[PDB]
Amino acid sequence: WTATSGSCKGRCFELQEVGPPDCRCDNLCKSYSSCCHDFDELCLKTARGWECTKDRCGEVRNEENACHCSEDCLSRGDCCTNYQVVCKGESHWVDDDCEEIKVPECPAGFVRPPLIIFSVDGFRASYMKKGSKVMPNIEKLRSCGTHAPYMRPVYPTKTFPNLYTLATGLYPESHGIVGNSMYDPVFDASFHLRGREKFNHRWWGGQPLWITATKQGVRAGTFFWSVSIPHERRILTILQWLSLPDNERPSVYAFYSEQPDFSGHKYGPFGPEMTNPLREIDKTVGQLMDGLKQLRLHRCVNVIFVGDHGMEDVTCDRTEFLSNYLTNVDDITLVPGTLGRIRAKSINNSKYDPKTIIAALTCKKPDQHFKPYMKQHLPKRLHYANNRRIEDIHLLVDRRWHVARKPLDVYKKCFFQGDHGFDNKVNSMQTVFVGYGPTFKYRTKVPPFENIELYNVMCDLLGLKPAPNNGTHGSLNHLLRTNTFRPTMPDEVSRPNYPGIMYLQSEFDLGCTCDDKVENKLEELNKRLHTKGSTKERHLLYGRPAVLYRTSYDILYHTDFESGYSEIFLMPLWTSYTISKQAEVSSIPEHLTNCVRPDVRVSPGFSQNCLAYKNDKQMSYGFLFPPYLSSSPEAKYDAFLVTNMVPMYPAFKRVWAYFQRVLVKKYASERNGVNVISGPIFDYNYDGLRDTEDEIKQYVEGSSIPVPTHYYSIITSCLDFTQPADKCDGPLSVSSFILPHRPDNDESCNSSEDESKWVEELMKMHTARVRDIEHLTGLDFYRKTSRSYSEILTLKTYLHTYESEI
Numbered sequence: 001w002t003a004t005s006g007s008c009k010g011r012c013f014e015l016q017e018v019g020p021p022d023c024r025c026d027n028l029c030k031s032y033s034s035c036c037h038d039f040d041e042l043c044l045k046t047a048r049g050w051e052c053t054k055d056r057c058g059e060v061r062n063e064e065n066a067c068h069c070s071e072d073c074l075s076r077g078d079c080c081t082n083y084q085v086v087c088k089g090e091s092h093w094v095d096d097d098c099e100e101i102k103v104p105e106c107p108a109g110f111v112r113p114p115l116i117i118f119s120v121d122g123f124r125a126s127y128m129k130k131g132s133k134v135m136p137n138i139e140k141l142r143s144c145g146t147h148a149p150y151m152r153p154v155y156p157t158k159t160f161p162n163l164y165t166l167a168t169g170l171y172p173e174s175h176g177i178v179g180n181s182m183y184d185p186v187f188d189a190s191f192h193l194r195g196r197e198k199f200n201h202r203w204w205g206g207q208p209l210w211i212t213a214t215k216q217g218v219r220a221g222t223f224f225w226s227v228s229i230p231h232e233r234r235i236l237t238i239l240q241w242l243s244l245p246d247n248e249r250p251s252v253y254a255f256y257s258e259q260p261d262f263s264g265h266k267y268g269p270f271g272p273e274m275t276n277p278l279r280e281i282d283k284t285v286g287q288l289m290d291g292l293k294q295l296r297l298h299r300c301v302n303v304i305f306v307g308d309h310g311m312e313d314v315t316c317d318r319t320e321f322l323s324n325y326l327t328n329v330d331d332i333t334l335v336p337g338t339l340g341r342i343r344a345k346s347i348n349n350s351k352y353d354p355k356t357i358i359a360a361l362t363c364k365k366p367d368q369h370f371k372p373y374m375k376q377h378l379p380k381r382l383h384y385a386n387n388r389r390i391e392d393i394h395l396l397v398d399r400r401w402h403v404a405r406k407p408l409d410v411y412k413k414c415f416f417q418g419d420h421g422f423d424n425k426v427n428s429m430q431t432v433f434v435g436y437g438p439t440f441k442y443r444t445k446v447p448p449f450e451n452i453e454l455y456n457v458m459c460d461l462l463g464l465k466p467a468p469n470n471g472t473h474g475s476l477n478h479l480l481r482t483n484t485f486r487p488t489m490p491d492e493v494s495r496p497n498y499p500g501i502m503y504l505q506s507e508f509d510l511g512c513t514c515d516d517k518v519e520n521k522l523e524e525l526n527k528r529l530h531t532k533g534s535t536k537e538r539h540l541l542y543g544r545p546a547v548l549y550r551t552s553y554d555i556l557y558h559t560d561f562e563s564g565y566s567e568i569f570l571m572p573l574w575t576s577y578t579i580s581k582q583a584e585v586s587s588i589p590e591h592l593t594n595c596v597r598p599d600v601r602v603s604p605g606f607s608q609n610c611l612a613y614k615n616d617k618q619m620s621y622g623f624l625f626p627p628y629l630s631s632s633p634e635a636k637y638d639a640f641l642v643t644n645m646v647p648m649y650p651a652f653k654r655v656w657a658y659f660q661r662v663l664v665k666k667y668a669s670e671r672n673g674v675n676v677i678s679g680p681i682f683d684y685n686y687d688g689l690r691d692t693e694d695e696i697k698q699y700v701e702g703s704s705i706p707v708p709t710h711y712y713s714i715i716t717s718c719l720d721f722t723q724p725a726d727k728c729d730g731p732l733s734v735s736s737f738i739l740p741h742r743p744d745n746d747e748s749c750n751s752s753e754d755e756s757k758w759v760e761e762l763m764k765m766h767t768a769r770v771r772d773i774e775h776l777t778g779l780d781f782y783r784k785t786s787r788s789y790s791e792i793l794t795l796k797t798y799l800h801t802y803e804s805e806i
C-alpha cells in the first residue's frame, strides 16, 4: 500500500528513493505504481512541446510549459535544448567543426568531468555505417571521438544480462542475471521481463557502477527510467541535474533508449521501418549535445554511446520444435527462443533423465538448427555455467532460428521479424562503442573489445577503484588520453626446479617399452647443451609462463621444445615450441609406434606409467609436443618421454592428432612461423578457474594421473607476417583455443568423416582468449616481450572469432 496522497512539489526526479509508504517522485516511481498523486502534473509537463520557436523567445515564464524560452531559463537550467539556437543565433552542436578537447573545459566548481552513458537497445554494429546518412550527431561523436568497429556483447545476447554486465564488469554467471527470464531453485522463485519479481534485489549480484560511485563519495544519477517517461524528458532531467549546486550534483548519469530494439523486433534489423527510429535516436543525441553546449559542458563531459546487443532476422517459420524430437515433451520445461534451457517439469520425478534427453536431441535431422549441450560442455569462451539459475541442459540455437517446445507455443503466443540472444561471436549480435570527451582520444579507432571491459574504464573516468570484476584492467588504456591506472604483472608464486640427470633407467618400473636401445664428442656435446637450454630462446619466445599459485614443478629443456612439468599433476602445465615456415612434418616411425621413455631427470614416483593406460580400457594417451614435428630423427626420441605424455580419450586423439599433424604446419606456413604453447586444463566444477588437486573427479584407472577436462593451445606469431615468428620486432598476433576433452565426438555431427571435414570447425567453435586460459591454469603468459604491458593485456583479451568482415 502507498499513501500516494503526499506531493511531488519541489521534488521532481529526486535522487534519493523515499521509504514507503511515503509516495515517490523518482524516475522509477511509475514502475512501482507508487508516484504521488501530482507526479504527472508537476514532473511530466508537456505543454508547448520540446523546442523553442521564434515567437517564444524571451517569453514570460509559464511554469506549465515542458521547457522554457524565457530569459531566465539558463540560470534556472530548464531551457528547451534548442533555446540558444533559436533565440540567440547559436549553432547546433552538430554543425560546429570538431576541435580536439585536450583538457577538460568545465565551469568553476566541477571537481571532475561528469560521465554520461547513453545506452541504446538493439543497436547493431553495422548501423554505424549503414545508417550513417540519417545519424549526423552520432556520426560526429563517432568520427571526432574514440570508436571501435564493434563491441562484443556477453552471452546470452539479451537486454538485461548485457546492461547489467555493462554496469558491473561481470559475466552473467557471476552477476546472476543469466537471461531475460530465470528460475532460481534456492529462492524457489522466478524472474521475468513483465512483473514485479525483477524488482527484488536478490536477483542482482555484483556491484554496479552507481553503487561503486556512491560508496566512494561520487554521486550518481539514477540509471533506470520508467518506460512511459518520454526521451525528451529524460534528457531534460539529466540537464537539470547538471545545474544543481556542486554538493548535490551527480558525477555519473545514464540515459537509456528502448529503440532501435523495439522496432527491430517488429521489422527486422534492416526493415524500411528502421530508418525513423535511427533518425529519432540521433535527434535525442542532438538534444543532449545542444543542451550540454548551452550549459558550457560540451567540452567538459565524457559521453559514452554504447549498445547492449545487435539484432538478427528471425521469423516464425524458422522454429525447431522439441516435440519433433522428444516423446516426453510434457515432462520438460523449456526456456525458449534464441537459446534453449531445459529442466524437469517436476523435481518429484526420478524418471527424468538428462542423458536421454540429450541423446534424443543430438544430430537427429540433417539440417538441425540447434545443438544440445550439458552446460559444462558449452565453449568456455561463453562463461555460461557457474550459476544455479542456468539449467544443466542448454541449446545453442543457430543464428536466424528459434527453438520452442511445441507448435501451440508459437501460434498461440506472424508477429516478429527480428530477435537476438544468439552466441556472442555472431556478427549480427555485435553492437557499438563510441567515447567522446576530454578523457577519450581524438579521432581514434581502437580494435573491437568485449563489453565486460567497460566497467573498469568508467571507474577510471570517475577516479573510482573498481570492485573485483571480469575485465582486465589496463587492456583498454589505449582508449584514453590520460589513464590513472597503470597495471603491473602479477608476481610469480612458485619458482621452478631445473633437474639434471638423477635416475638410472632401471629405477623405473612403469611398464613402458621403447625400441631406443638402438643407440663421439660432436653429437654428445650437442645433446647436453640442448638438455641445458641451448635452444631455449628459439622455443620460449616470450619468457616462461609464471606460475601464480603454490606448487611443485620442473623446467625440462629439449632440442625442439621446453616444458614446465608438474610433480603434483604428473604432466606438463605448459609445453612451448616454435615451428618455422620451413619446418618439415614427418611421421612416427613404425619401430616407435608404442614407445614411451622414462625421463632420467624426474623420479619414478613423479612419473606417469604405461600400465595404468593399458589397464584403463577407456583412456589412451597423446603427447603435448607432437612427434610429427621433431627437427630430426634423433630429436624425435625426446617427444616420447613419459614427461611429454597426457591422458586422452581415443575420440579426442582424432582431434588432437589432426591439429598436431596438419593444422600446426598450415598455421606456420600461413603466419610465417608460429610459437605454440599447449597444455591441460582441469575445471571439474565449471567455474572458469584452475582446479586444486582435491577437486579432480577422474583419474586414469588405478593411478593418480588426473584426467584433464580440456586441452588448450596458444598460437603466437608476428602481426607483420613479413617477419618470422622467431624474429619479430613489433606487435604480436595470437589465436588460442580450449578444446573440451570428451570421450565421444557427439558434438560434431560430421565426425564419422575425415578429420579435414570437421576438426577445424570444432576448434573454431572453442576459440578462446589467452586470458580465459590464464584463469583456467593459474599461469601468466608473455612475461618477456619488447611490448608495453598494456598492449600485452590487449593481446591477452583478443578473441579470434572466424566470422567474416562485418
Ligand SMILES: *[C@@H]1O[C@H](CO)[C@@H](O[C@@H]2O[C@H](CO)[C@@H](O[C@@H]3O[C@H](CO[C@H]4O[C@H](CO)[C@@H](O)[C@H](O[C@H]5O[C@H](CO)[C@@H](O)[C@H](O)[C@@H]5O[C@H]5O[C@H](CO)[C@@H](O)[C@H](O)[C@@H]5O)[C@@H]4O)[C@@H](O)[C@H](O[C@H]4O[C@H](CO)[C@@H](O)[C@H](O)[C@@H]4O[C@H]4O[C@H](CO)[C@@H](O)[C@H](O)[C@@H]4O)[C@@H]3O)[C@H](O)[C@H]2NC(C)=O)[C@H](O)[C@H]1NC(C)=O
Binding pocket: 170, 171, 173, 174, 175, 176, 202, 203, 204, 205, 206, 383, 386, 387, 388, 468, 469, 470, 687, 688, 689, 775
Ligand atoms: C569473474 O569475476 C568475479 C568477481 O571477481 C569472480 O567471482 C568471484 O569468485 C571468487 C572465487 O570463486 C568468489 O569468492 C568466494 O566468495 C564467497 C563469499 O561470497 C559472497 O560475498 C561476495 C563479496 O561481497 C559476493 O560478491 C558474493 O556474491 C555471490 O553470491 C551472491 C549470493 O549468493 C550472489 O548474489 C552473487 O551474484 C554471487 O554469485 C556468484 O558467485 C557464487 C560463489 O560465490 C556462485 O555460487 C554463483 O554461481 C555466482 O556465480 C557472495 O555473496 C566466500 O565465502 C568463498 O570462500 C570459500 O572458499 C575459499 C577459497 O579460498 C575458502 O578460503 C573459504 O574458507 C570458503 O570455503 C568455505 O565455503 C565453501 C563453499 O561454501 C565450503 O566448501 C568450505 O568447506 C568452507 O566452508 C569465496 O572466497 C567471489 O565471491 C566471486 N564474486 C562474484 C561477484 O561472483 C569470478 O571468479 C570471475 N570469473 C572468471 C572466469 O574469472
Ligand SMILES: Cc1ccc([C@]2(C)NC(=O)N(Cc3ccc(Cl)c(Cc4ccc(Cl)cc4)c3)C2=O)cc1
Binding pocket: 031, 117, 119, 159, 160, 163, 164, 166, 167, 198, 199, 223, 224, 225, 226, 227, 254, 255, 256, 306
Ligand atoms: C529492476 C528494474 C527496474 C526497472 C526497469 C526498466 C523500467 N526496464 C528496463 O528494461 N530498463 C532499462 C534497464 C535495464 C537493465 C539495467 Cl541494468 C538498466 C540500468 C543500466 C542502464 C544503462 C547501462 Cl550502460 C547499464 C545499466 C536499465 C528499466 O530501467 C528494469 C529493471
Ligand SMILES: [Ca+2]
Binding pocket: 682, 683, 684, 685, 686, 687, 688, 689, 690, 691
Ligand atoms: Ca574450477
Ligand SMILES: [Cl-]
Binding pocket: 156, 158, 178, 179, 180, 181, 335
Ligand atoms: Cl533468456
Ligand SMILES: [K+]
Binding pocket: 613, 614, 615, 616, 617, 618, 619, 620
Ligand atoms: K587404454
Ligand code: NA
Binding pocket: 745, 746, 747, 748, 749, 750, 751, 752
Ligand atoms: Na559425431
Ligand SMILES: [Zn+2]
Binding pocket: 122, 159, 261, 262, 265, 420
Ligand atoms: Zn530485444
